[PDB]
Write a structure and sequence with these properties.
This is part of a larger assembly, with 9 protein chains of 7 kinds.
Chain B: H1 2-8, H2 18-21, H3 32-48
Chain D: H1 4-7, E1 12-17, E2 53-58, E3 64-67, H2 71-81, H3 91-94, E4 101-105, H4 112-122, H5 139-147, H6 169-189, E5 198-202
Chain E: H1 3-9, E1 29-32, E2 38-42, E3 48-52, H2 86-92, H3 96-100, H4 102-108, E4 115-118, H5 127-134, E5 142-144, H6 156-170, E6 176-178, H7 190-204, E7 214-217, H8 224-229, H9 248-254, H10 267-272, H11 279-295, H12 303-320
């Protein structure tokens, strides 16, 4: 929807065998962000790599900690930070850094209180509107049968529904195929 | 070193880690050790001549 | 800084004001016992350039044979800070939480 | 000043010919990005140049110039060392196994080297040593042994009290031990000539 | 000398042909292109050179990471250079049926299936692959094992998988077979991690294509990462286990094209006489039968003759394995 | 310098490790014929004017 | 005629500034003799480039 | 098909200009021209000699 | 003569020794050197271009590198089956060419006594007329690859590998050896005979992928072929009628060719004591006692 260029960076991608990679990675990423268009940057799993390990015995990665500290430093003491934004996401709230609060740093905080069904049915309808489906749907069964499922899992339900629809002999997707797929893959 | 030692004064010469350097060897590729142990034998004869 | 934050904003205000130079010291230079020569190298650069100002943020992490190497690094820090150097010029600033 | 242009030649390399060919074209072993094979100059014959030797080679025309470079002890040892004398004539009938060598255990008190040399002197035979200095290459001594039948082989350097690592040095000595092992394996395997013996000495647990 | 005679006589015009083609920069290989007028090229001496493209070579004929002849004088490029019952049906309909009727799956559905999954004991495995090669309607595909991925001097595996995927693009979505995922699996081990993560990246990645194939066969399903990564794209997981009792008669019938077998010989009998027998194992049994049929100097083989060869060949191999 | 194989002529090693064959000038005495010494040739003529300790 | 002169002071010692002019032979003279030039007494003066490589090499 | 003995006449002019061209003899490829008058076939004289501006093409 | 002597420019002073990589159908080849330089030039005479066997050293120049030439530098039922295996492309073909099988996956030989006795016994039988290659013992398998390609050039012969036995490297180089022997990118080349002692130590991956044809357990010491070998060694020697071979070959355990040659040598040597040209049984046993006690004492 942003229509811009999208990038993909994960947590373990910042962890390597070499040392001092953090500074080079950050400076290079900011260099590409400086040279190129205002694209979209999204990183995931900042909680696992941001663990400060309360237990004092041992652990393998202290690097992404100071990498994050340096990232915040460049997101604070630098005027160019008004340039292209970097989106971060955390899976678990067990680990949180109090120094992440700032305009340049993490600002928006949204907690998800058990997302509803009908909305998932809506976005599923938006995703499946391209495929050919018999236009009779109660939506009640498919909304009710979905509990603690991802969006990718719903798309997987659609794909699974398209899988057996090929060997059923029908050229058009039916209603029960959705819930059948739900009970199939999940 | 020996001639400047005998030229200058009654200097005191110290040698450390003889176990690794003076160890005998066979192979020609490692024969450099045999060469330097022959150097050791040379200065051994020289210090035999340095007895008085 | 136990009651909140914003000290880094003041440090940034001073840094943007004069600061006499631009320098930053990471919290943990260890993971970068081979980091000792790196610390001595950084301090060697600190001796190279006479004016210096040190900014250290979140030092409470490093303040805490696993513990033995930590104590050894602390002893190295003591040896370096209490060694022979001129501190009348170089300035150090430490930021923390609790 | 006529040589000044040969100074302008920017010097000349050092040629080494490892192999000669019947095509009258000499190949030369040189430093990397080397190996330039070309016939030599006409005023100098090819056959005169010996393989595996260093020569003078110009860096332009690649032409060769010239070639470049104790009574109780002796009582017991008599029947040992003097055994190879006149015995092998009747050993064809006897067919007894000839003694490979003899070793003594104890401190290096007196006459360690002088004994074998004295007995060899009374035997009127040459004394052949090893003395490795500047592959296996242990066959050459056996070739010399084939050349001169009477011989006496005694090892001085093998008797050792002074200095060792005992870790890697034990293996370093184990190389020589393996050498005399395969030597004894050759002697036990067959015999090119008689009068071949080995006398070692050890002052320690070895 | 005689074959070099006419050639020596043909060496006359080579002097006049010596002027062109003589230039060699020793084939420096490129990397990428930031812009069309200027390209960055890296020689094997680790020296990066830059030169504009000549008019003799089209920009559309330039491929990423391609070796071409380049002038050492004008620096330009004159010319380039070329250098079961239900389960078996379920896994058959994901290979044969789609290829037989490509348009059918387009009209009757949104998209054709992907592939299947093979785990557990080897069983009759790897035989069905060769069988699929034998049932190929047009041209056999290229199979790639997992031992080629992990090699000394790492980093070559990336270029290897990318160049074989490039060949797959040249083959316009050819069938791709993978084997021994446990070798590069099991997520000093970082060198393997990079290769397997790049493998998953190229698999789930739709860049080359998403319609090609997915096949995985391993003895030990101890790999956690491919297991969690696969359901996002890969699907249709079934149980393999071992061959069934009446399942061997199919292999017998497909092996019936071999040397003539007497009608007195029962297939189910020979099938039940050797429990836990792989397709290749009973293939070796038929090999023994044919061999001893040749050694018997007869024109036919009777079960009573080689049954000894059967129980012997199965028990002897059952002893150590 | 490396070695002297004959009279008024010898071989000289370079910095790269490649040994060079250059005849010395008649003015230079036998003092420079020492087996191990630091010798300086010309960047072009490759001749030794003098040696340094 | 087209006199060709090439000067290269870089590797040329300051002891001698002597330079050698160049000429171009015809390609149709390969059948007959190479150089049909009289006054051969000056070839010794043309022998100044006595280098054993480039001369009879090229 | 006639060939005589030619000898190139060189004065101090062209020499010194080729010395300045020697200072201009940097590894960058350079161009130069020679001028004169031909009285006959077997003699050649050069007088006017100048340099040329450098280029990236060589 | 003139056209033959006009090529002296290329083979003259500007000449070097390079290494060719491969031959291209585009008539411009590719060579290599210490710095790995490549030069593509049209071909010339004096080169074979066929039997040249690319990947060796060739002749280069300081010139454009136009090449002027190159410079060279109870087992009866078991033994009859392996006979019809390895001797299949050999004498008495008429039991083959009628139909044919040709399973060049090689075989596996082993047994409880081991010590390469039966292995060398079966190997020496094929040494009548052939090119034999013996490999004993087990960075990567570079030398194994060299042996593989040299056996690829030696393909019209019989290859026999003897004594087949960190730790994780052995497994992966075993998998590499298995993959290389499988002939993935190459067709049938040369018969490879695997020989070892204990089959229990070998992994199952060395059985099914390696050999698709047959493998036979060792039923007994096989005094027959051994009797044949002893007959061959004693063929030049002399013996009486009171000397039984059976108990002699039954008594001996784990002996090699050099071993039996040694005990025969000492048999004749001990028969030289009485100056007799004939070796008896008791003298043979008494002589054998020497070596038998020799190796068991240490």
């Amino acid at each position: 929807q942003t229509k811009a260029t999208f990038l993909k960076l994960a947590g373990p991608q910042l962890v390597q065998m070499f040392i001092g990679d953090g500074a080079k990675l950050v400076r290079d990423a900011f260099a590409l962000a400086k040279e190129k268009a205002p694209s979209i940057i999204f990183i995931d799993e900042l909680d696992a790599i941001g663990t400060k390990r309360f237990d004092s015995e041992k652990a393998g990665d202290r690097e992404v900690q100071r990498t994050m500290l340096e990232l915040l430093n460049q997101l604070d003491g630098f005027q160019p930070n008004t340039q292209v934004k970097v989106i971060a996401a955390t899976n678990r709230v067990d680990i949180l850094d109090p120094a992440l609060l700032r305009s340049g740093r993490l600002d928006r905080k949204i907690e998800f209180p058990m997302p509803n069904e009908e909305a998932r049915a809506r976005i599923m309808q938006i995703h499946s509107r391209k495929m050919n489906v018999s236009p009779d749907v109660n939506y009640e069964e498919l909304a009710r049968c979905t509990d603690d499922f991802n969006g990718a899992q719903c798309k997987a339900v659609c794909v699974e529904a398209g899988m057996i629809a090929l060997r059923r002999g029908a050229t058009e997707l039916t209603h029960e195929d959705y819930m059948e797929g739900i009970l199939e893959v999940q | 070193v020996f001639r400047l030692a005998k030229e200058n004064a009654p200097a005191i010469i110290f040698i450390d880690e003889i176990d690794a350097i003076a160890t005998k060897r066979f192979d020609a590729q490692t024969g450099a050790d045999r060469e330097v142990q022959r150097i050791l034998l040379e200065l051994l004869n020289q210090m035999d001549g340095f007895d008085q | 800084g136990p009651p909140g934050t914003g000290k880094t904003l003041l440090a940034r205000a001073v840094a943007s004001q004069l600061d006499c130079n631009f320098l930053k010291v990471v919290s943990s230079s260890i993971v970068d016992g081979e980091s000792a020569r790196l610390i001595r190298e950084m301090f060697n650069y600190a001796r190279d350039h006479q004016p210096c100002i040190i900014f250290m943020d979140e030092i409470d992490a490093i303040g805490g044979s696993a513990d033995r190497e930590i104590q050894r690094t602390l002893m190295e820090l003591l040896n370096q800070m209490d060694g022979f150097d001129t501190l009348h010029r170089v300035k150090m600033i430490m930021a923390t939480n609790r | 000043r006529e040589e000044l242009q040969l100074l302008q030649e920017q010097g000349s390399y050092v040629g080494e010919v490892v192999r000669a060919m019947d095509k009258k074209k000499v190949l030369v072993k040189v430093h990397p990005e080397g190996k330039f094979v070309v016939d030599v100059d006409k005023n100098i014959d090819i056959n005169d140049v010996t393989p595996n030797c260093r020569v003078a080679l110009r860096n332009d025309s690649y032409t060769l110039h010239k070639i470049l470079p104790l009574d109780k002890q002796i009582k017991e040892i008599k029947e040992v060392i003097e055994l190879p004398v006149k015995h092998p004539e009747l050993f064809e009938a006897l067919g007894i196994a000839q003694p490979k060598g003899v070793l003594l255990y104890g401190p290096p008190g007196t006459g360690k080297t002088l004994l074998a040399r004295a007995v060899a002197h009374h035997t009127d035979c040459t004394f052949i040593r090893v003395s490795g200095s500047e592959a296996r290459m242990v066959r050459e001594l056996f070739v010399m042994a084939r050349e001169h039948a009477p011989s006496i082989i005694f090892m001085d350097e093998i008797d050792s009290i002074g200095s060792s690592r005992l870790e890697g040095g034990s293996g370093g000595d184990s190389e020589v031990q393996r050498t005399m092992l395969e030597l004894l394996n050759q002697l036990d395997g067959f015999e090119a000539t008689k009068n071949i013996k080995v006398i070692m000495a050890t002052n320690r647990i070895d | 000398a005689p074959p070099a005679l006419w050639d020596l006589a043909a060496d006359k015009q080579t002097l006049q042909s010596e002027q062109p083609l003589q230039v060699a920069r020793c084939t420096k290989i490129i990397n990428a292109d930031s812009e069309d007028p200027k390209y960055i090229i890296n020689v094997k001496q680790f020296a990066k050179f830059v030169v504009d493209l000549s008019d003799q070579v089209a920009p559309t004929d330039i491929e990423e990471g391609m070796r071409v002849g380049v002038d050492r004088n004008k620096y330009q490029i004159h010319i380039p250079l070329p250098p079961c019952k239900e389960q078996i049906e379920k896994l058959r309909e994901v290979v044969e049926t789609p290829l037989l009727h490509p348009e059918r799956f387009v009209n009757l559905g949104i998209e054709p299936p992907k592939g299947v999954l093979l785990f557990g004991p080897p069983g009759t495995g790897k035989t069905l692959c060769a069988r699929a090669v034998a049932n190929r309607t047009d041209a056999c595909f290229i199979r790639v094992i997992g031992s080629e991925l992990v090699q000394k001097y790492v980093g070559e595996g990336a270029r290897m998988v990318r160049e074989l995927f490039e060949m797959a693009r040249t083959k316009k979505a050819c069938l791709i077979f993978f084997d021994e995922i446990d070798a590069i699996g099991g997520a000093g081990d970082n060198e393997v991690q990079r290769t397997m993560l790049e493998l998953i990246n190229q698999l789930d990645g739709f860049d080359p294509r998403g319609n090609i194939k997915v096949l995985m066969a391993t003895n030990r399903p101890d790999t956690l990462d491919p297991a969690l990564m696969r359901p996002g794209r890969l699907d249709r997981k079934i149980e393999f286990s071992l061959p069934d009792l009446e399942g061997r008669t199919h292999i017998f019938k497909i092996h019936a094209r071999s040397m003539s077998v007497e009608r007195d010989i029962r297939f189910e009998l020979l099938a039940r006489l050797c429990p836990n027998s792989t397709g290749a194992e009973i293939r070796s049994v038929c090999t023994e039968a044919g061999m001893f049929a040749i050694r018997a100097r007869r024109k036919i083989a009777t079960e009573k003759d080689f049954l000894e060869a059967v129980n012997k060949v199965i028990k002897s191999y059952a002893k150590f394995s | 310098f490396l070695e002297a194989v004959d009279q008024n002529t010898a071989i000289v090693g370079s910095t790269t490790g490649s040994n060079y064959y250059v005849r010395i000038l008649s003015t230079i005495d036998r003092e420079l014929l020492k087996p191990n010494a630091s010798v300086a040739l010309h960047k072009h003529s490759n001749a030794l004017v003098d040696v340094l300790p | 005629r087209a006199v060709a002169v090439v000067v290269d002071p870089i590797q040329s010692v300051k002891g001698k500034v002597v330079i050698d002019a160049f000429r171009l032979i015809n390609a149709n003279m390969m059948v007959l003799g190479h150089e049909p030039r009289q006054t051969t007494s000056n070839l010794g003066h043309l022998n100044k480039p006595s280098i054993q490589a480039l001369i009879h090499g090229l | 098909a006639v060939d005589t003995a030619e000898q190139v006449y060189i004065s101090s002019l062209a020499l010194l200009k080729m010395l300045k061209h020697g200072r201009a003899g940097v590894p960058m490829e350079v161009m130069g021209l020679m001028l004169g008058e031909f009285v006959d076939d077997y003699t050649v004289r050069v007088i006017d000699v100048f340099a040329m501006p450098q280029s990236g093409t060589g | 003569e003139e056209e033959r002597s006009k090529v002296d420019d290329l083979r003259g002073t500007p000449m070097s020794v390079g290494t060719l990589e491969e031959i291209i159908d585009d008539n411009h080849a590719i060579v290599s050197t210490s710095v790995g330089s490549e030069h593509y030039v049209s071909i010339l005479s004096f080169v074979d271009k066929d039997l040249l066997e690319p990947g060796c050293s060739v002749l280069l120049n300081h010139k454009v590198h136009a090449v002027i030439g190159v410079l060279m530098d109870g087992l009866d039922n078991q033994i009859q089956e392996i006979k019809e295996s390895v001797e299949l492309p050999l004498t008495h073909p008429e039991y083959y060419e009628e139909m044919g099988i040709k399973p060049p996956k090689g075989v596996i030989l082993y047994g409880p006594p081991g010590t390469g006795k039966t292995l060398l016994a079966k190997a020496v039988a094929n040494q009548t007329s052939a090119t034999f290659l013996r490999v004993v013992g087990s960075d990567g398998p570079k030398l194994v690859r060299e042996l593989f390609r040299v056996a690829e050039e030696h393909a019209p012969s019989i290859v026999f590998i003897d004594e087949i036995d960190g730790e994780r490297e052995i497994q992966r180089t075993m998998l590499e050896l298995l993959n290389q022997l499988d002939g993935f990118d190459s067709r049938g080349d040369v018969k490879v005979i695997m020989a070892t002692n204990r089959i229990e130590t070998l992994d199952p991956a060395l059985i099914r992928p390696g050999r698709i044809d047959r493998k036979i357990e060792f039923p007994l010491p096989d005094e027959k072929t051994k009797k044949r070998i002893f007959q061959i060694h004693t063929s030049r020697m002399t013996l009486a009628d009171d000397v039984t071979l059976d108990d002699l070959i039954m008594a001996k355990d784990d002996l090699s060719g050099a071993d039996i040659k040694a005990i025969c040598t000492e048999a004749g040597l001990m028969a030289l004591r009485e100056r007799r040209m004939k070796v008896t049984n008791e003298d043979f046993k008494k002589s054998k006692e020497n070596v038998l006690y020799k190796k068991q004492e240490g």
